[PDB]
Design a protein around this nucleic acid. Structure first.
Lengths: 134, 127, 102
RNA sequence: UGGUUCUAUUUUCUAGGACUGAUUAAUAGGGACGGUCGGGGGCAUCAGUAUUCAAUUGUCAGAGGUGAAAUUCUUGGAUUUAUUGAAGACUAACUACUGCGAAAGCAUUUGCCAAGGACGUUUUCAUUAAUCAAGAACGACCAUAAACUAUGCCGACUAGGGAUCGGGUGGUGUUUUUUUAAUGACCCACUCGGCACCUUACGAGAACUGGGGGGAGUAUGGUCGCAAGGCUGAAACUUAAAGGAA
């Protein structure tokens, strides 16, 4: 295990060089989401190019709440969606060539990780119960 | 592990190794009250709560006077009539150290608890 | 053309990497030649660490430019031109100049 | 998206009504991104020289092999030499108290397929987490070896030191170099994470199944065994030949 994460500043204010509007950021957010990017991609594009540090600080609330209150909710949370599509990519690799025992092992690991947070999201009922991973 | 237990573990073995400062993270109200009662009885010196916005850090300065902290992991209820018995069974000696309790009136040691006549659940000990 | 075995045994030392490449190239005649190449990773002057290994992506990039520029030296030569090119060891100088960037 | 009517100049601007309402952001965990990293895996491709076999020469009497020999091959040319082809393996030196993998393990090139880790992150979710009984994954033909001298004090535990592998930041010199793209190598300091090594300080560290009782010896009027005699022939026979012994 390694310690490599992001270090959120002690400040909770806009950084006083951020001369943009607190609403034009939201309009850019919903524009990028409607052209089709995941919320982590919205956050990293907004951070890199239109220099909002983080939008829970600069806007009102966090950007998945912004997308759900502006009508662009996800069908399934981003974590579960990315782990689902990684699992189905490994599954198509396994149907293609069937002597990859290591990739079978990594499929068992990815499927366990699917079930863990699918169980969490189900008891929170973000997604409905009787959800199965096909 | 717990959050009071690893703080008291750091404050124990750092003093065994002979350091004059511990940094313990994270920090809760119960940790502040536990260090509060043990500096009220003179086992640690000053301590400081650095507030980062996550959970808080404590830098304790401690001289030599502690020799064991601990927590009693089932928080069983004790009575005012059995404070003396529980001190007899878990303390080193008769008047050596203090059992620390969570009471109605907050975190207190056993002798303050029976002084102002209130029982509670056990938390931990210091001697 | 071939080295003697004692030459490349005299070149191989531990604590470096040997990058070796080979290409099967057809010349400006219709001779087709399998032509090889060896190279050993130097250490710079002032280098104090004893290793001077290449990071294997530098090996893939060095082997890539070795293959490209020596298949450029063939196809642009006949057999007589290639022989007169590799007598005074100058394709080695072309490899060295093209690879000291890596 | 639908509908009703109110103000001054043939078309200008207007007002109203029906289809959300608690925190952080763990030197906890997950997910995304970025440049990468590795002898991690799978498929395909490429190469290398040995070995074995074969074809063609050249030459002639031996060649293996062993401590000596022998089985074996050989004037129907063995072994040696040269050219070439085919086969099945294998990846030499580089090769390390290095790397990667959950372990068993993994070393030629190039490409494809998915994967993984560390780092960077003012990205995202927000407790989704840790340990393991149970259970699951990996581990009629041609016939095979494994261990075998070893080591060490343990954990909830403090600091270090040198060297090395992967990433990052900064410095500002040399190799680099230029108006085709981006991209190095080394030196130094810091920092994160690894494989090890050399030390330090401080703690109860208690509460593929079947087992007699120490080590080195000694004695034996017990029990169970094995063992002597005495020239063979040769005993009911004083007995041949032949052999042994001296």
């Amino acid at each position: 295990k390694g310690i490599s994460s992001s270090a959120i500043p002690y400040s909770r204010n806009a950084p006083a060089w951020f001369k943009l509007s607190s609403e034009s950021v939201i309009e850019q957010i919903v524009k990028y989401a409607r052209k089709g990017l995941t919320p982590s991609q919205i956050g990293v594009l907004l951070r890199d190019a239109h220099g909002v540090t983080q939008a829970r600080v600069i806007t009102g609330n966090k950007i998945m709440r912004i997308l759900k209150s502006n009508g662009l909710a996800p069908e399934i949370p981003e974590d579960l969606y990315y782990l689902i599509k990684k699992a189905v990519s490994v599954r198509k690799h396994l149907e293609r060539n069937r002597k990859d025992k290591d990739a079978k092992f990594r499929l068992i690991l990815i499927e366990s990780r699917i079930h863990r947070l699918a169980r969490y999201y189900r008891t929170v009922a973000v997604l409905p119960p009787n959800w199965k991973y096909e | 592990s717990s959050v009071l237990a690893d703080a008291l573990n750091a404050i124990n073995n750092a003093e065994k190794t002979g350091k004059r400062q511990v940094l313990l993270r994270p920090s809760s109200k119960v940790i502040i009250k536990f260090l509060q009662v043990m500096q009220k009885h003179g086992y640690i010196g000053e301590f400081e709560y650095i507030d980062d916005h996550r959970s808080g850090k404590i830098v304790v300065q401690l001289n030599g006077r502690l020799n064991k902290c601990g927590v009693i992991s089932p928080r069983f209820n004790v009575k005012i009539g059995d404070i003396e018995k529980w001190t007899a069974n878990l303390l080193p000696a008769r008047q050596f150290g203090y059992v620390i309790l969570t009471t109605s009136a907050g975190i207190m040691d056993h002798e303050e608890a029976r002084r102002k006549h209130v029982s509670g659940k056990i938390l931990g000990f210091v001697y | 053309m071939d080295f003697t075995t004692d030459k490349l045994r005299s070149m191989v030392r531990k604590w470096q990497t040997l990058i070796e490449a080979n290409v099967t190239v057809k010349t400006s005649d219709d001779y087709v030649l399998r032509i090889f190449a060896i190279a050993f990773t130097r250490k710079q002057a002032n280098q104090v660490k004893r290793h001077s290994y290449a990071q294997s992506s530098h090996i893939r990039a060095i082997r890539k430019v070795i293959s490209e520029i020596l298949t450029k030296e063939v196809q642009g030569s006949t057999l007589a031109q290639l022989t007169s090119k590799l007598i005074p060891e100058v394709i080695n100088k072309e490899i060295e100049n093209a690879t000291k960037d890596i």
